[PDB]
Design an enzyme around this catalytic site. Structure first.
Site, PDB file in Angstrom:
ATOM      1  N   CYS A 206      -8.469   9.042   6.196  1.00  0.00           N
ATOM      2  CA  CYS A 206      -8.510   8.980   7.701  1.00  0.00           C
ATOM      3  C   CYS A 206      -7.163   9.498   8.150  1.00  0.00           C
ATOM      4  O   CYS A 206      -7.083  10.097   9.242  1.00  0.00           O
ATOM      5  CB  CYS A 206      -8.712   7.571   8.352  1.00  0.00           C
ATOM      6  SG  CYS A 206      -9.987   6.692   7.611  1.00  0.00           S
TER       7      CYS A 206
ATOM      8  N   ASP B 279     -10.224   2.661  13.671  1.00  0.00           N
ATOM      9  CA  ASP B 279     -10.844   1.423  14.046  1.00  0.00           C
ATOM     10  C   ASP B 279      -9.793   0.629  14.745  1.00  0.00           C
ATOM     11  O   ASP B 279      -8.864   0.086  14.102  1.00  0.00           O
ATOM     12  CB  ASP B 279     -11.361   0.650  12.803  1.00  0.00           C
ATOM     13  CG  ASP B 279     -11.926  -0.717  13.161  1.00  0.00           C
ATOM     14  OD1 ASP B 279     -11.886  -1.144  14.309  1.00  0.00           O
ATOM     15  OD2 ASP B 279     -12.504  -1.354  12.270  1.00  0.00           O
TER      16      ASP B 279
ATOM     17  N   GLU C 293       0.814  -1.207   0.000  1.00  0.00           N
ATOM     18  CA  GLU C 293       0.000   0.000   0.000  1.00  0.00           C
ATOM     19  C   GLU C 293       0.832   1.233   0.000  1.00  0.00           C
ATOM     20  O   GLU C 293       0.527   2.218  -0.690  1.00  0.00           O
ATOM     21  CB  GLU C 293      -1.002   0.036   1.218  1.00  0.00           C
ATOM     22  CG  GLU C 293      -1.995   1.213   1.053  1.00  0.00           C
ATOM     23  CD  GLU C 293      -2.664   1.573   2.418  1.00  0.00           C
ATOM     24  OE1 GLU C 293      -1.895   1.748   3.413  1.00  0.00           O
ATOM     25  OE2 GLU C 293      -3.888   1.674   2.439  1.00  0.00           O
TER      26      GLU C 293
ATOM     27  N   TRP D 285      -8.400  -1.966  -0.856  1.00  0.00           N
ATOM     28  CA  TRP D 285      -9.093  -0.814  -1.410  1.00  0.00           C
ATOM     29  C   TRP D 285     -10.105  -1.169  -2.499  1.00  0.00           C
ATOM     30  O   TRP D 285     -10.731  -0.282  -3.032  1.00  0.00           O
ATOM     31  CB  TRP D 285      -8.094   0.159  -2.024  1.00  0.00           C
ATOM     32  CG  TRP D 285      -7.309   1.095  -1.004  1.00  0.00           C
ATOM     33  CD1 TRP D 285      -6.112   0.864  -0.414  1.00  0.00           C
ATOM     34  CD2 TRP D 285      -7.731   2.381  -0.587  1.00  0.00           C
ATOM     35  NE1 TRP D 285      -5.746   1.945   0.402  1.00  0.00           N
ATOM     36  CE2 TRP D 285      -6.733   2.893   0.298  1.00  0.00           C
ATOM     37  CE3 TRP D 285      -8.858   3.176  -0.886  1.00  0.00           C
ATOM     38  CZ2 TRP D 285      -6.839   4.179   0.898  1.00  0.00           C
ATOM     39  CZ3 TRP D 285      -8.967   4.465  -0.262  1.00  0.00           C
ATOM     40  CH2 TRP D 285      -7.954   4.942   0.609  1.00  0.00           C
TER      41      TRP D 285
ATOM     42  N   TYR E 169      -4.902   9.389  -1.377  1.00  0.00           N
ATOM     43  CA  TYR E 169      -3.606   9.741  -0.785  1.00  0.00           C
ATOM     44  C   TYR E 169      -2.467   9.971  -1.738  1.00  0.00           C
ATOM     45  O   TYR E 169      -1.816  10.973  -1.686  1.00  0.00           O
ATOM     46  CB  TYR E 169      -3.135   8.600   0.129  1.00  0.00           C
ATOM     47  CG  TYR E 169      -4.002   8.407   1.351  1.00  0.00           C
ATOM     48  CD1 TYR E 169      -4.966   7.418   1.365  1.00  0.00           C
ATOM     49  CD2 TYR E 169      -3.826   9.218   2.483  1.00  0.00           C
ATOM     50  CE1 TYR E 169      -5.807   7.215   2.483  1.00  0.00           C
ATOM     51  CE2 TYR E 169      -4.630   9.019   3.644  1.00  0.00           C
ATOM     52  CZ  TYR E 169      -5.577   8.029   3.637  1.00  0.00           C
ATOM     53  OH  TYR E 169      -6.357   7.818   4.724  1.00  0.00           O
TER      54      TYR E 169
ATOM     55  N   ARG F 148      -7.869  11.087  11.881  1.00  0.00           N
ATOM     56  CA  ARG F 148      -9.200  11.574  12.288  1.00  0.00           C
ATOM     57  C   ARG F 148     -10.165  10.463  12.801  1.00  0.00           C
ATOM     58  O   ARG F 148     -11.110  10.751  13.568  1.00  0.00           O
ATOM     59  CB  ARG F 148      -9.860  12.346  11.117  1.00  0.00           C
ATOM     60  CG  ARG F 148     -10.189  11.402   9.942  1.00  0.00           C
ATOM     61  CD  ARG F 148     -11.068  12.155   8.890  1.00  0.00           C
ATOM     62  NE  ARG F 148     -11.391  11.215   7.802  1.00  0.00           N
ATOM     63  CZ  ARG F 148     -12.268  10.253   7.855  1.00  0.00           C
ATOM     64  NH1 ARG F 148     -13.068  10.132   8.899  1.00  0.00           N
ATOM     65  NH2 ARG F 148     -12.352   9.437   6.810  1.00  0.00           N
TER      66      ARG F 148
END
Lengths: 280, 283
Positions: free
Chosen positions: A169, A192, A61, A83, A109, A189
């Protein structure tokens, strides 16, 4: 003293003191707003051990961000499918992106990191030389002015949000140099605790390792800051068991050759040593 | 315990465990990277007491952001001069901003909060309908989807940094709602513990009171996150004094009338009650 105890105490804190709160689907969490942990990067690598983290997905990633890609298929083709749901035909259509090819996440991103402020068209467009290359500016600033208090890469782009399949996030990170050591702080922000957090910690500690390698510094700390820190209600029991597990010593991350520029890193350049996570 | 103990303890940490680190002008600091404190806003207001904070300057400055001003003169006319240096002729030229008129800070907080992504021209331009009004977007989101995990206002705008007289130390903030209470977390990239941080805490505490007022919620927590948290070496003794002061209970902040829009607040709407700080200390 083991760094993973911070994460485990965070989870217990949320279980004990968090408030019920729903997410976008109306599904329940226990949540706390505002937390912070510090993971040392000094001769170890914080890949959590009380439940296995998908390291191959972490690494692929990140390489995918660094190449500025916004095509979910380009990560999926590495055998990392995390994704793929967000770029599916039916998810895109539900956001009104019917003109988009499948896999097209919009300006997420990688695009913001390498081309912030450029005009997004699609995932196949050639964005060479457009927008601000935040990742390169971060690197060049660390090299030339290590005391700088402005060393920030920000994925949060209010102008591009409506185009994104998901707002990031990982909203921004800051880097910091003292005593020959490079540290990084992430503002996340939304976290999980059960699924994403351990993977995000490994992601930014990896980035720190990569940037310290090319700027000639040693990794310092990774400082993890959360906004909405939460646990899904149907993860509470598996977590209460994971919370009984003693963490194993963290592994080491080894970079297997001298690498000159961030774009030049490949999977084979890395090796995690002594990773012994507890079982499923 | 008293919420102010958090701040004092952060000062103490930095004095004990901080590393020497030079700033922009090569003047020395003791520095720690990464700190967080939580200040309750529940029936109290975190205006520091171990030394007096410049409350008037807090309020005017915030009002000035909200109206979207980037003109340091417009704030100076209220007798708040904290931006005047950054908009001085000499400062502006030192940064290669020759064309720019005095007071013109470039696209700083006011402009980012109300017009993010807009093309900046100068402090006198009319930016109506241009860019993203993040501040209003925050208020509307809070009203309609309080569970939202994306309630962010970001002043950090990579595109506009080159035009700014100073990139924002207050890079981003996030709002959060649970149980009818509004909280706010600030990401502050750089915090001058002696001079800046107590003022910063009250500023964002006040923004959260104001949004809470407008949206029909009660103030929750202000969570203050720092990047480079530092103490200038010539503030070490004044701060050692301050550390031997006991904090007196925090005041209350009163909003004196029903306000409907964030743009409609004025200085007279606010009253600080029970504010009994130890003397000033100069720094």
């Amino acid at each position: 003293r083991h760094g993973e105890l911070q994460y485990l105490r965070q989870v217990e804190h949320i279980l004990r003191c968090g408030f019920k709160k729903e997410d976008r689907t109306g599904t329940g969490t226990l949540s706390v707003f505002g937390m912070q942990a510090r993971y040392s990067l000094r001769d170890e690598f914080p890949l959590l051990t009380t439940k296995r983290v998908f390291w191959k997905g972490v690494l692929e990633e990140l390489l995918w961000f660094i190449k500025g890609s916004t095509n979910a298929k380009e990560l999926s083709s590495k055998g990392v499918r995390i994704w793929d749901a967000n770029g599916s035909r039916d998810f895109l259509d539900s956001l009104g992106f019917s003109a988009r090819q499948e896999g097209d996440l919009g300006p997420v991103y990688g695009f913001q990191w390498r081309h912030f402020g450029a005009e997004y068209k699609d995932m196949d467009s050639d964005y060479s030389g457009q927008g601000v290359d935040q990742l390169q500016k971060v690197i060049d600033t660390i090299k030339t002015n290590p005391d700088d208090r402005r060393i920030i890469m920000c994925a949060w782009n209010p102008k591009d949000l409506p185009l994104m399949a998901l707002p990031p996030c990982h909203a921004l990170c800051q880097f910091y140099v003292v005593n020959g050591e490079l540290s990084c702080q992430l503002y996340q922000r939304s976290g999980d605790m059960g699924l994403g957090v351990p993977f995000n910690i490994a992601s930014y500690a990896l980035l720190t390792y990569m940037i310290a390698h090319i700027t000639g510094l040693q990794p310092g700390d990774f400082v993890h800051t959360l906004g909405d820190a939460h646990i899904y209600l149907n993860h509470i029991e598996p977590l209460k068991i994971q919370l009984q597990r003693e963490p194993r010593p963290f592994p080491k991350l080894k970079i297997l050759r001298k690498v000159e520029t961030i774009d030049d890193f490949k999977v084979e350049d890395f090796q995690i040593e002594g990773y012994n996570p507890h079982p499923t």
